[PDB]
């Protein structure tokens, strides 16, 4: 073309993306804030589920959220172009100059980027616990708490993080012309080992995990176990209380269940908290669990096919800034967070339709299960807990809820 | 998984 460049070209394409993805984003938000403004009165349908009183401390809690996750969107928008525009990431790559040396040259690098990344969102993170959740009085958190907590946290990723990253990128420059194939094998290794490691030894240093007692809840769950054929090592109750009024459940293994305080507690009956297991045994009995694990080697072995394709493009590194030199690390951030942001959007809308769809069929295997009456009762008082609002505009729940609205599972559950 |  005697009109237009080439490397210029790329990396405006990418920018351009980035913003209609996000204005996409920022009109479905608009779209469900006019619902929580719109709707004032309580619908006849949800009439029975939640109360004015209720709705009303919903409607401002989504409100003041909506409102705060525009500016704190808009913020991370802005900076995001802003550094790119100005040329921030190939500027901090020369600071932390001056194959042994590449990856050294990328470790601190990493150490850098990750040190901004967590400073500049610390401020919003703040807000979010002690102005949001603390006006609606969900927070439990001090501010002692909530720094510990942020340093804890960084200290544990960074030791993570390096170990991981100088391997991984040690294994791209080291093998070949298949380094693909090796470097995608890694992070399959890596995955399973820290899938393992997390529960047992990384999250309890965050939150105090206690086994559950002994009693009425623990003897039923126990009968509900063996009744599935679940292999209970243990049952746990998160010290969830310490940081929010906000209620949930999970579960993990290679088996042993995880269950909040507050949902325990005010919270739900042991009826309800058994119907809500039923619904977590779901996800294990009709393999959900293995079904994602199958999609996430499945895409990682796809991005490191068309990485493996991409990487010897020296097009992709002169359009973001880097002229002089094409290094790794840089080209697993251009093409895995830039070229490849198309794909992971998509992939990310398919997964979301999918976790909906996986929710209903764990809801089924607990209407199955005969505690469908129970889990009806649970979902409505859980939403209660949670200020949850019962109304949500179509093409925003479509788009960002991986649950699907509550009144959809009520009447599945009905049915 | 989880609930909510
Ligand atoms: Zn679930």
């Given at each position: 073309?005697?009109?237009?460049?080439?490397?210029?070209?790329?990396?405006?394409?990418?920018?351009?993306?980035?913003?209609?993805?996000?204005?996409?984003?920022?009109?479905?938000?608009?779209?469900?804030?006019?619902?929580?403004?719109?709707?004032?009165?309580?619908?006849?349908?949800?009439?029975?589920?939640?109360?004015?009183?209720?709705?009303?401390?919903?409607?401002?809690?989504?409100?003041?959220?909506?409102?705060?996750?525009?500016?704190?969107?808009?913020?991370?928008?802005?900076?995001?172009?802003?550094?790119?525009?100005?040329?921030?990431?190939?500027?901090?790559?020369?600071?932390?100059?001056?194959?042994?040396?590449?990856?050294?040259?990328?470790?601190?690098?990493?150490?850098?980027?990750?040190?901004?990344?967590?400073?500049?969102?610390?401020?919003?993170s703040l807000?979010n616990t002690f102005?949001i959740e603390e006006?609606?009085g969900f927070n439990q958190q001090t501010l002692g708490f909530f720094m510990k907590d942020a340093?804890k946290k960084?200290?544990?990723?960074?030791?993570?993080?390096?170990?991981?990253?100088?391997?991984?990128?040690?294994?791209?420059?080291?093998?070949?012309?298949?380094?693909?194939?090796?470097?995608?094998?890694?992070?399959?290794?890596?995955?399973?080992?820290?899938?393992?490691?997390?529960?047992?030894?990384?999250a309890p240093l965050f939150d105090k995990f206690?086994?559950?007692?002994?009693?009425?809840?623990?003897?039923?769950?126990?009968?509900?176990?063996?009744?599935?054929?679940?292999?209970?090592?243990?049952?746990?109750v998160v010290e969830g209380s310490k940081r929010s009024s906000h209620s949930n459940?999970?579960?993990?293994?290679?088996?042993?269940?995880?269950?909040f305080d507050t949902l325990?507690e005010?919270?739900?009956?042991?009826?309800?908290?058994?119907?809500?297991?039923?619904?977590?045994?779901?996800?294990?009995?009709?393999?959900?669990?293995?079904?994602?694990?199958?999609?996430?080697?499945?895409?990682?072995?796809?991005?490191?096919?068309?990485?493996?394709?991409?990487?010897?493009?020296?097009?992709?590194?002169?359009?973001?800034?880097?002229?002089?030199?094409?290094?790794?690390?840089?080209?697993?951030?251009?093409?895995?967070?830039?070229?490849?942001?198309?794909?992971?959007?998509?992939?990310?809308?398919?997964?979301?339709?999918?976790?909906?769809?996986?929710?209903?069929?764990?809801?089924?295997?607990?209407?199955?299960?005969?505690?469908?009456?129970?889990?009806?009762?649970?979902?409505?008082?859980?939403?209660?807990?949670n200020?949850?609002?019962?109304?949500?505009?179509?093409?925003?729940?479509?788009?960002?809820?991986?649950?699907?609205?509550?009144?959809?599972?009520?009447?599945?559950?009905?049915? | 998984?989880?609930?909510?």
């Open positions: 073309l005697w009109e237009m460049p080439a490397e210029k070209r790329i990396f405006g394409a990418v920018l351009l993306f980035s913003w209609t993805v996000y204005l996409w984003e920022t009109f479905l938000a608009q779209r469900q804030r006019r619902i929580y403004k719109t709707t004032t009165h309580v619908p006849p349908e949800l009439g029975q589920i939640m109360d004015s009183e209720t709705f009303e401390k919903s409607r401002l809690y989504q409100l003041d959220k909506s409102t705060f996750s525009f500016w704190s969107g808009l913020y991370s928008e802005t900076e995001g172009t802003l550094i790119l525009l100005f040329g921030g990431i190939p500027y901090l790559w020369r600071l932390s100059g001056r194959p042994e040396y590449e990856i050294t040259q990328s470790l601190v690098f990493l150490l850098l980027a990750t040190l901004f990344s967590a400073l500049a969102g610390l401020p919003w807000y102005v006006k609606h340093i960084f200290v544990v990723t960074q030791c993570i993080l390096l170990p991981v990253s100088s391997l991984l990128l040690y294994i791209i420059k080291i093998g070949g012309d298949y380094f693909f194939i090796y470097a995608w094998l890694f992070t399959l290794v890596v995955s399973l080992v820290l899938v393992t490691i997390y529960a047992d030894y990384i206690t086994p559950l007692p002994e009693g009425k809840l623990k003897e039923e769950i126990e009968v509900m176990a063996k009744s599935i054929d679940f292999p209970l090592t243990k049952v746990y459940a999970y579960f993990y293994g290679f088996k042993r269940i995880v269950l325990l005010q919270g739900c009956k042991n009826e309800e908290v058994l119907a809500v297991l039923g619904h977590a045994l779901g996800h294990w009995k009709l393999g959900h669990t293995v079904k994602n694990i199958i999609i996430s080697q499945m895409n990682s072995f796809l991005c490191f096919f068309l990485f493996a394709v991409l990487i010897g493009r020296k097009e992709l590194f002169a359009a973001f800034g880097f002229y002089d030199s094409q290094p790794t690390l840089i080209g697993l951030l251009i093409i895995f967070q830039f070229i490849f942001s198309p794909y992971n959007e998509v992939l990310s809308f398919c997964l979301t339709v999918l976790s909906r769809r996986f929710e209903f069929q764990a809801d089924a295997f607990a209407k199955k299960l005969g505690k469908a009456k129970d889990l009806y009762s649970a979902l409505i008082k859980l939403n209660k807990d200020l949850g609002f019962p109304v949500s505009d179509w093409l925003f729940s479509m788009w960002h809820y991986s649950h699907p609205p509550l009144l959809e599972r009520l009447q599945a559950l009905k049915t | 998984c989880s609930i909510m």
